[PDB]
Amino acid sequence: LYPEEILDTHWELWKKTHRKQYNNKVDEISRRLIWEKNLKYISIHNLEASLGVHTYELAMNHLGDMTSEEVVQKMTGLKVPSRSNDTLYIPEWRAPDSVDYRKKGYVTPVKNQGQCGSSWAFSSVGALEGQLKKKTGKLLNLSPQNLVDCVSENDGCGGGYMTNAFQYVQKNRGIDSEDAYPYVGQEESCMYNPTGKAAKCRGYREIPEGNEKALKRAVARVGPVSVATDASLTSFQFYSKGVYYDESCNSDNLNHAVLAVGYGIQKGNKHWIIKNSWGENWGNKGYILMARNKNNACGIANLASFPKM
Amino acid sequence: GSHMLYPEEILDTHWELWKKTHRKQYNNKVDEISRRLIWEKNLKYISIHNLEASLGVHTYELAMNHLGDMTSEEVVQ
Ligand SMILES: [Cl-]
Ligand code: NA
CATH number for the domain spanning A79: value is 3.90.70.10
- Does A196 contact B at CB distance below 8 Å? no
CB atoms within 10 A of CB A201: 13
CB atoms within 10 A of CB A154: 25
Give CA–CA dist A240/A55, Å, rounded: 11
* CA-to-CA separations, A215 to A106, B53, B59, in angstroms, rounded: 18, 30, 25
**To what resolution in angstroms was this structure determined?**
1.9
DSSP B11: G
- Buried b vs exposed e over A7-40: b needs ≥16 C-beta within 10 Å? eeeebeebbeeeeeeeeeeeebeebbeebbebbe
Q: Count how many domains chain A has.
A: 1
Cα(A148) to ligand 2 centroid in Å equals 8
Backbone phi, psi, residue B30, to 5°: -65, -45
Burial of A265 (0-12, 13-18, 19+ CB in 10 A): middle
3-state secondary structure of B56: coil
φ/ψ region of A283 (left if φ > 0, alpha if ψ in -120 to 50, else beta) reads left
β-strands A204-206, A305-307: how paired?
A: antiparallel
CA B75 to chain A, closest CA, distance in angstroms equals 10
CA distance A145 to A10: 36
3-state class of B37 per DSSP?
helix
**Of A225, A1, A7, A251, whose CA–CA distance to A124 is shortest?**
A225
Chain B residues 4-63 with CB within 8 Å of chain A:
53, 56, 59-60, 62-63
Distance (Å) from the alpha carbon of B2 to chain A's nearest alpha carbon? 35
Mutate to test the interface with B, among A125, A136, A177 (most CBs of B within 10 A): A136
Beta bridge partners of A269: A266
Name the residue range of residue A289's domain: 1-309
Return the SS3 of B13.
helix
Question: How is residue B55 annotated by DSSP?
Answer: T
> Which residues have CB under 8 Å from A197's CB, separation 6+?
A171
A41 near A70, Cβ under 8 Å? no
The answer, for B64 touching chain A at a CB cutoff of 8 Å, is: no
State the method.
X-ray
Total number of domains constituting chain B: 1
Domain that holds residue B68: 1-77
- Given an 8 Å threshold on Cβ–Cβ distance, is B59 in contact with A309? yes
Please write down the HEC assignment for all residues of chain A.
CCCCHHHHHHHHHHHHHCCCCCCCHHHHHHHHHHHHHHHHHHHHHHHHHHCCCCCEEECCCCCCCCCHHHHHHHHCCECCCCCCHHHECCCCCCCCCCEECCCCCCCCCCCECCCCECHHHHHHHHHHHHHHHHHHCCCCCECHHHHHHHCCCCCCCECECHHHHHHHHHHHCCCCECCCCCCCCCCCCCCCCCCCCCCCCCCEEECCCCCHHHHHHHHHHCCCEEEEECCCCHHHHCEEEEEECCCCCCCCCCCEEEEEEEEEEECCEEEEEEECCECCCCCECCEEEEECCCCCHHHCCCCCEEECC
Ligand 1 centre from A105 Cα, in Å? 7
Residue A68: partners with Cβ closer than 8 Å, 6 or more residues away: A232, A233, A234, A236, A237
* Ligand 2 mean position, distance from CA A117 (Å): 15
Q: From the CA of A141, how many Å to the nearest CA of chain B?
A: 14
The answer to whether A306 and A225 are in contact (CB under 8 A) is yes
CA angle A204, B59, A301 (to 5 degrees): 20
Nearest alpha carbon to residue A223 among A301, A111, A141, A107 = A107
Q: Other C-beta atoms within 10 Å of B77: how many? A: 6
Which phi and psi (to 5°) does residue A196 adopt? -90, -175
Closest CB to A169: pick one of B59, B63, B65. B59
Name the residue facing A173 among B56, B62, B65 (closest C-beta): B56
**Phi, psi (5° rounding) for residue B71?**
-85, 170
